[PDB]
Structures are given as structure tokens and as C-alpha cells.
Amino acid sequence: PRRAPAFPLSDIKAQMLFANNIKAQQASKRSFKEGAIETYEGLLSVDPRFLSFKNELSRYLTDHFPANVDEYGRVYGNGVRTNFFGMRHMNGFPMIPATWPLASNLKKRADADLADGPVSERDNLLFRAAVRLMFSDLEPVPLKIRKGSSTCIPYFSNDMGTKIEIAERALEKAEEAGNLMLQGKFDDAYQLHQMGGAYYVVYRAQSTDAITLDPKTGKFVSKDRMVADFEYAVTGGEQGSLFAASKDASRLKEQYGIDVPDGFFCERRRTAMGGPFALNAPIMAVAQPVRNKIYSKYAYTFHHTTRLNKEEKVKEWSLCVATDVSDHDTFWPGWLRDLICDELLNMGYAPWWVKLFETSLKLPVYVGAPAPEQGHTLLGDPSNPDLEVGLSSGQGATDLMGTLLMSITYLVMQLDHTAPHLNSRIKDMPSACRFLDSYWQGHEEIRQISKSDDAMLGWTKGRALVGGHRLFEMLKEGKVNPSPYMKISYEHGGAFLGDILLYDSRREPGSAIFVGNINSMLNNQFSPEYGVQSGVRDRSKRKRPFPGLAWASMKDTYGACPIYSDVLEAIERCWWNAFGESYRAYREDMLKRDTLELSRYVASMARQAGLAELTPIDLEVLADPNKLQYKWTEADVSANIHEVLMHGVSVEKTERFLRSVMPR
């Protein structure tokens, strides 16, 4: 059923993805790398005291605070949803091998019984209405770029001046590049404007993953994570194999002489992709305006900030269903990419821009190093982009692609199982747009709050309510997928964007509250994804610029968890046992040092002004900018803090670009 073509790095098609400079050449050849991360300055993730601390703390918390999740997956009582063993990983050392990314997900979708297009004309109108409401009356804004971020293929530059020039030039030449692609001249568009080529695959650590303790044996068991070998990936699963990666860490002793305590494992690794920046720039120039529109006009459904901000909406509901989606990015459908492009053309968007967008969602992928002695292979032919990888993580609008797919998918699930009486309001495009516009503003008896693959579905009192309960019961039974589009189930311990929905004895939205997930506090403080990069002088370019600051926002973020105090005390006690020092004093010192370091980066902060003006969000973001790529957005951050982390291209240049893209 068509194996994707594959080319070794030595092949000219792969060589052309890397410019003639040392960084790009090194990225092309980089071999498998592993090693302990520097968890905090001077502390390695495999330090024997640190592991002893994690062993004691994870056992203690699990023993004293067993999960409180009912049969319907609602969290109550102590606010705990699983054991605390997820922290038992040797951070920096990956499971082996990581997966080869699937070149085509068509068979994966068909075999999971998911549809190859909108099932009914109503659904077709709703997906298209989503495109019309999201992309219509957009306002230009400057194109912001993360400081220190890479341009990936083909230059691999991390220099801000170079990145700004690449982006400006890309906005100037996107039209000529898109028209070349409309003529089938992808090699020309790539050679002349670097628009095309491939995504560059980097494997990221998912630092904590499930682990259970077998009461029978007293031995810990890590969750098996299935990975595809090369044959499987290039044949869409027709050949080759899907098998459990090895998380066994015993090897670290033999290989590096690192002591491995019982029940500690190698980390789960996930594929992540960096896009060719010249192609992404023109897409980001439209995506940000779209985010601004949906987070303002449709803030009810899409703009989520604090626990209370979420709580206000959910408290008004009579029923709240916390859904889960299996493997969202890999199952994301290429037919939606095509439906979206078709609808943008219908709205009058420039064809050359739609073509760039379409191409960014069919691009080849260059696999670097999934394991020792493996990799350095290009999947797909850049001369004619035709992959179906699902949704690429580094595409310039991935968050929006997942949000559009899922928001309509959940609305369809509510229509299908609970509100057939609303079907008559969706007769054609005009009526579909009116209905979706009202639904997204939270004005219908069926509602939702969502972001990509996380969501909570709601029902107020009314005719749909009774159906809502049957849908919830169908999810609980878990025998039939309620959607024809993606694999949907209910979340075990319902949460939304990091906050757990804590129910009381009534088990009703009206008396439930959103609280911080104490397990996420533990993940962030003791299993960060990256080391502190103490050798990177410019802190704003680090993955974790000011780790100490999170101590100042901790109470605000996690204080409402029922066992907040208990956890902080267990930490103090266990850290004393392991290090013979106070964890609280250690964090207070780090907070002081980082607060002083911060004033050097903030123009408005006096040589030692302090943190008085900063919000909890500001602090969480400065300690972990990653939260700005999955939890919050630019407007949620104080302006002077956003500037520490991001730089932009002039709105004058983007304003002119946008005028040439958008309809009349």
C-alpha cells in the first residue's frame, strides 16, 4: 500500500537539507547521546542522595495518599489520582530505542475504525464553519520568535539577528515560493527560499511516566511504551514491528558505572520535530492573529488561564465530562488538512499561501538518532511532499490544527449522542457559522472548554442533559468509541490544562473546584525535562532561565491541593534524610539568587527591584518557558517578561505580508 521512499544521509536528497556550516553538518550527523541532567546547579539527576530521596518520598506519598478517583474517573478527597512512583526515572537516560515516526497514518486510522473524511454533510459544514470563524477578520501583530530557538533546516542557526533576517526575507518571498509550489516546483522553492525540505526529528524526554509496584513481588514495573522500527514506520504498519521499548536501567551500571537503585528506569522519549523556519515564518504570521481572535471573541471555549477562570465556567454546568484522546498527533487526519485548505481558498485566501500551509502538513521528516547505531535517514521525497504523519509538532500552527479538529469532534459527539434537536439549526454554511459562533461563546445548552487534546464537555439544564448522562455512561463502560473521528475515552481523574477538578460528596460541577495537581509540582521540581544549562551565559536562551522563581509561585499554583502542606512536609523530612539540609532553605536561596539574576534581564527592574510586580504566571514561565507553548499564551504574561523570552519582527513587515494573504 506504498512504502514511503527513504534516503540515507549520504544521499544528495538528504545532504541538501543541511547547509555548508558546522552547526547544520553536526545536526545531520549527531549520534545518539545520553547522560545525567544537571537537575539544579551542582546536582545530577543520578546523584545517589537524590535517588535515595526520590525512593523514600515516592514510597511514602504513595503509601499515605492513595488515589481518590471514583468509578466515573472523578477526583475527590485528597486530590490524588495515581501513585507517586512516576518520579523514579534516571533523567537524561532514554528508553531504547525511541520510535521511528510513521510516514503514513492512513492504515493506522482505518484499522482503528476512524473515518477518512466528514461522515455527514452536517459535520462537513461544522469543520468548514470552524475554518470560517477562526480565519476571518484577523488583525496583524508582530511575528514573535523564541530567543535561542533554532531555524532548523537547512541553516540550524540559533542567532537572533540571523533568525530575524530569515523571517523577514521569508515574508517577502513566500508568495514567489508558494507559486512555485503551485506549479509543482518544490525543489526550486526550497533551493531559492528554503521553503520545503523536511522536519528535523529530535527526541524529547517525557521525564515522568507510569510505574506501579507489584504487591505480589515487591518489584516495580514501568509502563511499556510501544515503538515502531524503521520497516513499520515506512510501510504505515503493513510490515515491520511495533514492540515495547526497553526502560531497563541496569545497563547504566555496566556502561557508566552509575549505581541504579531498585525500581528506577530510563525515561520515556517522544518524537518532536523542528520545522524549516523559512516555511514556518509565513505560517506563524497568520497563526498568531488567529490565536488572538479565538482567545478574544471565543474566549469562553478557548482562553484558559487560572484555576478560577476555569472554575467559573464549569460551576454553571449540570454535568461536566472530562475527555481523553488517544495519541492525538499521530492520528490527526490529513483529510482535515485538505478540508481546511479548500475552505480557506473558498474564503478568498491567497492560493500561494494556502499552498505553503498545505505543504507544511505533508513534509518529509529527517530522523536523527532514535538509538545507538540507528537513524540519519530522510523519510519522504522533498521533491514532492506527500507524507501523512498526522500533525507535526513543529508546524507553525499545530496548536490551532489540533484545537480545530478536537473542538468540532467534541461538538459532534454532543450532537450525536445528546442533542439531535439542534441538528435543524445546521442547514447550510450561514446557519452552521451562526450556530458554531453561538456554541463557542458558551451560549448553548451544550458547552465545552478545550485546548488541542484536553477538554471538558458540559451540559446545562435542558433537553440535552439526559443525553449527556447516557454519553457519560457510555464512556464509563468503555466498549464503544463515541466518535467516528478520533479515539475518545474519559480521563481517569478528570483534569483540564493541569488543574484537577475536585468534586465533593455530591459529585456535581456546581460544588466542585479546580485545584493544582500536586503530582505536577513534584514532576517539575524533581524531574525537569532539561538540565539547568549552567554553561549557557545568556539565561534567556536556556530551556529553564530562572529555576529558582518557581518557589515564589508555588503556593499560588498548588496551594489548593488538599494535601499541599503534607507534601511539602514529606519533602522537607525526606530531603533532610538524604542531604542533611533543609529543602525549604535550599529553595529560598535559589529564589534569592535567581531574583537578583532576573533584574539583569528586565530593563524596568532596578538593580535589585524584586518580584513585586510579577504574577504567578510570570514566575512559572520564567522557570519553564515551555509552559508558554502548551499552557498559556503571550497575553497571559506581563509585557516586560514576554520580552525577556521573545523577540519580534516589525508589525510593519507583517502587516504588509498579511494584507497580501487575507481576502480582499
- Using the contact rule CB under 5 A, the part of the chain among 191-199, 303-311, 469-477, 490-498 near Mn ion is 490-498
Where does this chain touch Mn ion (CB under 5 A) — which range of 79-87, 231-239, 266-274, 451-459? Answer: 451-459
The 400-439 site mask, x for binding Mn ion (CB under 5 A), equals: ----------------------------------------
From the CB of 491, what's the least distance to Mn ion, in Å? Answer: 4
Shortest reach from residue 456's CB to Mn ion, in Å:
7
State in angstroms the smallest separation of the CB of 324 from Mn ion.
Answer: 6
Which of 109-117, 453-461, 563-571, 645-653 is the region at the interface with Mn ion (rule: CB under 5 A)? 453-461
Q: Smaller CB distance to Mn ion: residue 322 or 552?
A: 322
Q: Which residue, 54 or 303, is less far from Mn ion as judged by CB? A: 303
In the bound complex, what is the minimum distance in angstroms from residue 493's beta carbon to Mn ion? 9
Crossing angle (nearest 10°) for helices 351-360 and 160-182: 110
Q: Is the peptide bond before 154 cis (omega within 30 degrees of 0)?
A: yes
Nearer to Mn ion, 388 or 454 (CB): 454
Straight-line distance from the first to the last Cα atom of the chain, in angstroms, rounded to the nearest whole number: 43
* 298 is known to lie in a ligand binding site: no
Binding mask 495-514 toward Mn ion (x if CB under 5 A, else -) reads x-------------------
Whether residue 538 is annotated as binding a ligand: the answer is no
490 carries a ligand binding annotation? yes
From the list 97-105, 492-500, 502-510, 606-614, the region that binds Mn ion by CB under 5 A is 492-500
Cβ-based nearer residue to Mn ion, 475 or 591: 475
Contacts of 659 (CB under 8 A, 6+ apart): 140
- Judged by CB under 5 A, the residue of 388, 454, 618, 636 near Mn ion is 454
Distance CA 244, CA 242 (A): 7
Give the C-alpha separation, 472 to 15, whole Å. 52
Residues recorded for the chain: 664
Residue 637 beta carbon to Mn ion: minimum distance, rounded to whole angstroms: 23
Query: Between 452 and 633, whose beta carbon lies closer to Mn ion?
Result: 452
Write out the three cell numbers for 432.
452552521
Sequence-ordered list of residues with C-beta below 8 angstroms from that of 210, at least 6 positions apart, any chain: 82, 85, 86, 222, 223
Binding-site size, Mn ion (CB under 5 A): 3
R_g over Cα of the chain: 25
Local structure of 2: helix, strand or coil: coil
Beta strands in 61-166 (DSSP E): 89-94, 143-146
Largest CA distance in the chain: 70
- Coil/strand/helix, residue 331: helix
Asked, as a colleague might, if the bond just before 625 is cis with ω within 30 of 0, I would say no
User: For Mn ion, which stretch binds (CB under 5 A), given 412-420, 449-457, 554-562, 619-627?
Assistant: 449-457
Nearer to Mn ion, 368 or 516 (CB): 516
User: In the complex with Mn ion, which residue's Cβ is closer, 495 or 521?
Assistant: 495
Closest approach, Cβ 322 to Mn ion, in A, equals: 5
Give the nearer residue to Mn ion in terms of CB position, either 87 or 495: 495
Minimum distance from CB of 563 to Mn ion (Å)? 20
Cα(623)–Cα(551) distance, rounded to whole angstroms? 9
Region from 255-263, 400-408, 454-462, 475-483 binding Mn ion, contact rule CB under 5 A: 454-462
Min separation Cβ 496 and Mn ion, Å? 5
CA distance 14 to 61: 50
- From candidates 38, 388, 453, 491, binder to Mn ion by CB under 5 A: 491
Q: Tell me how far apart the alpha carbons of residues 367 and 200 are, in angstroms, rounded to a whole number.
A: 7
- Kindly state whether residue 453 participates in binding Mn ion, applying the rule CB under 5 A: no
> Which of 84-92, 183-191, 428-436, 485-493 is the region at the interface with Mn ion (rule: CB under 5 A)?
485-493
Nearer to Mn ion, 493 or 547 (CB): 493
Query: Per residue in 272-293, is it b (16+ CB within 10 Å) or e — as a string?
Result: ebbbbbbbbbbbbbbbbbbbbb
CB of 495 to Mn ion, least distance (A): 5
How is 460-493 classified by DSSP, letter by letter?
Answer: -SSTTHHHHHHHHHHHHHTSS-S-SSS-EEE-SS
Q: Which is nearer to Mn ion, 175 or 454 (CB)?
A: 454
CB of 457 to Mn ion, least distance (A): 11
Contacts of 496 (CB under 8 A, 6+ apart): 304, 310, 322, 449, 454, 455, 456, 514
CB of 453 to Mn ion, least distance (A): 8
Are the beta carbons of 304 and 496 closer than 8 angstroms?
yes
What lies within 8 Å, CB to CB, of 566 at 6+ separation is: 64, 65
Task: Enumerate residues 548-577 that contact Mn ion by CB under 5 A.
Answer: none
**8 A C-beta contact, residue 603 and residue 640:** yes
* Residue in the block written with cell 475527590: 76
CA pair distance 405, 452, nearest whole angstrom: 8
Contacts of 185 (CB under 8 A, 6+ apart): none
Which C-beta is closer to Mn ion: that of 4 or that of 405? 405
- Output the known binding site for Mg(2+): 453, 490, 494
Which residues make up the interface to Mn ion (CB under 5 A)?
A: 454, 491, 495
- Output the known binding site: 453, 490, 494
